[PDB]
Subunit: 277 residues, 6 copies
């Protein structure tokens, strides 16, 4: 998409950064330009005290139709290994920046999600789809295996049988099927999707943000640990959150529940407006 700075756009609304792939006429294909610009935008939004949540959406009828077969594959193969490695590092680096983002991330998938879009899909903590969205590991249909981690995304989110069929047959899952097999959290009609995402973002914004970061990372990390190692790890993490959370939110919440009896944590969030312990 001619200018690099035009390949991604964003708006800040009510402390949510709404970030969009912005190559609509190229179905939001991941070119090196988009991969560099997406990192730049993610890097500048990450530690803004007024950005609580990042939503990743797409302009036009695609969410993301994968890597750019022209600009990511053909043009880089022409500059040899050096060009291939530079292009790969640009794509992998922004998926990783999104995966470990300081703020909670949400995929808003209204349309086409193919191939190398699976990395960014997985890198979002939560994911909400339109019924009319279509998800495919289309890689087998153009003679390549599902790289950019896409095979691992399918295996880490979906049942083995479902991942195997998805990668071998290159057939598409509807939003409803993507939700049934846990590729995404939920599917709904396209005309309801933005409002649901906005509601989820507004709920996260009400939580202690430090607590949400430590929790979302804990979920990602304890997948790659034994039960017994994860038990000790979660204790170590809470000691870190104790340092990070200057608001001392656990003591604030304990006072509101035990002493004030103004909320029940089983039924709703503590009031982080209040600061008395």
């Amino acid at each position: 998409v001619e200018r690099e700075e035009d390949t991604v756009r964003y708006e800040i609304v009510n402390n949510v950064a709404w970030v969009y792939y912005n190559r609509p006429t190229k179905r939001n294909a991941q070119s090196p330009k988009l991969n560099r610009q997406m990192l730049k935008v993610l890097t500048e939004l990450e530690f803004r005290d007024d950005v609580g949540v990042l939503v990743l959406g797409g302009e036009g009828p695609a969410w993301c139709a994968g890597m750019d077969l022209k600009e990511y594959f053909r043009e880089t193969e022409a500059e040899g290994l050096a060009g291939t490695r530079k292009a790969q590092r640009e794509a992998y680096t922004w998926w990783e920046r999104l995966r470990w983002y300081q703020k909670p991330t949400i995929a808003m998938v209204h349309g086409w999600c193919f191939g190398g879009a699976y990395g960014p899909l997985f890198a979002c903590d939560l994911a909400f789809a339109a019924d009319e969205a279509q998800f495919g590991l289309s890689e087998v249909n153009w003679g390549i295996l599902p790289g950019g981690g896409a095979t691992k995304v399918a295996v880490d989110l979906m049942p083995m049988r479902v991942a195997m069929y998805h990668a071998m047959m290159g057939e598409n899952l509807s939003g409803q099927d993507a939700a049934r097999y846990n590729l995404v959290n939920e599917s709904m009609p396209a005309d309801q999707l933005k409002a649901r995402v906005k509601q989820v973002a507004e709920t996260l914004i009400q939580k202690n943000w430090a607590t949400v970061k430590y929790t979302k990372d804990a979920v990602r990390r304890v997948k790659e640990m034994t039960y017994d190692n994860a038990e000790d790890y979660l204790i170590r993490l809470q000691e870190g959150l104790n340092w990070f959370d200057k608001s001392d939110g656990r003591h604030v919440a304990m006072k509101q529940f035990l002493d004030d009896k103004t909320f029940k944590p089983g039924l709703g969030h503590y009031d982080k407006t209040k600061t008395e312990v």
Copy 2:
């Protein structure tokens, strides 16, 4: 709950130990008193030749509403690190004793199941819920991450997307949702739950008890092994069961199927009354 020995109760009925969290007016919150008494009760029931199955239920409207914010957190923080570590070891030790219990374990979850109740929920081999039960990682709602292993429980039982939403949003799953996402085996109306649990216990009691112990441990252990390592491990385990099972139940069953033709193992259990090989 004033006296330590009153924090847990049990009944033995038809070789099933029905164990209940017994702090109903405190929603069965896990205080250090309950954590010590639960270990004591589990330890004394474990190797009783008349206890075939242990069911973990709760008195009052909660199953278990998590750790006691007053007695487990506030009062122990006041005695410093020493008090915190003593309290943590008491909670972790009984969840582990339950997780590796000599006898099959069943969670009977009729009501509230929150936070640090996830360890005991996972430590039960099987789990049956009331439709009216509510399951939550409420930790984020009082500003802490889901410790006492609860994050790992969510990740080891439920699809990653579901675990992520559950831990970040602190919203509750109904019994039906808890069953759909494999937090529990089944959900049913509260008025049907005890009878279903009683039926499941009576089925396990009819199996070779040594076989059930070796099998339930095998399921837990092979999650943390490669396929190829698990293949050899399962051979090693059967050699152990051969030693442990004095009834020589595999030869008893082989005679009943091959020679007597009185049962078909695909369709029902062998008669462990009979002892001829």
Copy 3:
């Protein structure tokens, strides 16, 4: 089944090897004869340029009712450890040959699938069941734990709760339940099953066969890797596929999509008839 060479049969139809367990009157039980003959048949079909897909079905009312309690267990125990180890190696070796087969594999499960049939069930990449099929870890019902890897199969395919219940209770899953819990891909009436399998095989045959092999192995392998290790591994695999695929199918497909615009990989396979890059 008296002669070893009669324990397995196959037909080649439209480049699909239809292989059948052929001990119908013994419910296709895995005897040492069948284990040796199944390896021999799999070994001779594997690298045939006219075999694109292998389907594993069964003659008679069983798919596979497990190991032969008479010929695999009783008769080998009578020749001691030496006989037991020889028999075990014959069973494990053919399940492994099937699991890593050069060609895509499909389980066509019309009927009984018990115990040590789980290894071959898992060793097939894809699996399609009749509603009337019945799947059981019947091992607990004859006093043994689910060996021949069967416990690991249950844990690698199904949710932990479901695997635990399945192994401890020795109750059977219907085809529909086997599909809901991802033991198989799909369930349908028995009279529709062969046609669905034939359709799936004919779709795989249309893909680049080298691409399908590399992909199906990738799915199996990345389960046993961290996300970050799997990212690099998938790059290494594509470099291998580049060598293996003399048809240079990725460049063929790129031309058809970018230059010719005759297909869209999100919506269907490239035409591997064409050879221009």
Copy 4:
């Protein structure tokens, strides 16, 4: 050793708890009495503000000659599985309490170290031996495999070849050989051993104690992680140490090096007497 409270002794000298196995005439064999008393002593010393280091030594000519063949094995086998499991839990629990101890631990091994003494040997962070000490996995010589984790100790400390020979041949390593193969840190004549241990303890006491705890745990934990997972884990740990260390020792040390230039951390410890940042 008739009274349980006599099976272990300790002295506090210059903030070092010198703990000794105290069954000299039974070569410090681990009986259930000693296993219970060792946990009690470790538990009461752990969080003493005047205990900086714990040294584990032995009275008489043995350090520890393993499990008590009479009181740990024979007498417990006589009370059946229940007695065996109680005895095993008592031994495993104190080795684990020592392995994760709040304070740095040192093994002072002057003499015999056999079998089930390997768990406590490994559970000590550091280990110093007399030339005249003798270390053996003597288990094979009395027909058992090296349990109580001893096989794993040998594999986690020594080269595979050395561990294999040690476990299969049941021959003894001298102190010098134990040091060459990294079973211990150092070996020296018995008459020099206590002074070296005293010197090592006095060096640890001069460090920031919170820093030593976080570091020693980090070493133990990162063995069971991939490089890339360990990188993130070590960041999480430092955030915890930031909370735990009220002395804010990293800022104290930075001032002494950058501003005051009174020490060089490459060459010695910062002065934790000073409190200015």
Copy 5:
């Protein structure tokens, strides 16, 4: 080496099977003929009640100079993938049969040990070298990476730095260096090697053979487990050894130590001649 049955020879002496690679004039290169014959010989010796130990040596100046560049590589590449896979399976299968052998195995390495000889070298439990032996990952010197697992052998036995240098530089280790870096147990002059191996074999033959098998497997297996998983695994293994060991050697040994006081297991093996418990 013209006839397949001539590629391997063996002698039985004092219950030790002395097996030799027998292609001396081809430096004992692993051809498909040798790979098939080595499996056949290993398979027939394994469960002989008069074979306690297997030693793997070589005829002529090589132990094993790796895979046969002519018969294993060139001739099989000429029959395509099918020929390559058949040849690979023959080599891998016998290395694995040796690695998990029922009996203890010893490598007697008097001379050249190169490349694909590392699999068999590692598959032997113990290894003894001549000073004049030379060990090399010569693969880099003929433009291939160290396959047949050789890279993994180097990493599992030697320090990472040593393995890296060994694989990248294709320079040779002397016997003494091979012992210093734990590729083998010991190095000695060639004229002393056979007698040392004979002495080691005669020591293993005096141990309880079932105990040696369970122990040697435990060492190999606990490398691929967390400490805490290995603790439970070793308990499971002893339950298996209890079944396998009809001699009830642990009770025999306990009587000889506790009651008879005729041996000290720290200092020597129990007398397995005696059978009283």
Copy 6:
């Protein structure tokens, strides 16, 4: 070191890129300027057809004295979390670029190597030290745990006991000790070090460069795999090297050994001047 472009220097000599940390008067401390410039230099040298090997040395009396306590820690803490994360990503990213470098890497450590220098030390494939070099995890001496992966470096290279002592005691290893415990490959007098490194580089340059890359990565990767997974992985890697190596060096070498008999791979590298197969 005032200008960013001055913090690193390099020379190309005989196809070796000699790269030096260039803040001699600050003992080559890793400031954000150096971390950015080191990535830039590594990135531009990596795919130069005239760069076969990269050596990492240091100007002045240090190799690398760790992170810059002023510019990496103090100044970034002053810009908050955003500044800390930016600085961490710059350091981690260049250590990783070096660790997976297309070309073989060598650490030339003539002097001080402290703390956060361990990441770059480990990221070099090979390492050669001066006797007068001093290696320390000095972190404990300034009250922090050994981050920037340094703890993991110590555990992945050195015996557990040695790593534990090194991290807890903050005492320094000499070059000779660093070599004995496998932190580096070799130690020699400082006046011999450059010539030895030059000789090692000139040997690597004579090998097939594609072969060296695939091999060095294989060594790093198979540490984090089971034996059985590593066996298959190494086959996959050779298929990749077959694609990457246009020189078809394995067939060139096979001709020189089998047909021409001009070299013996056990004793030296094939002549990659020659191109006939």
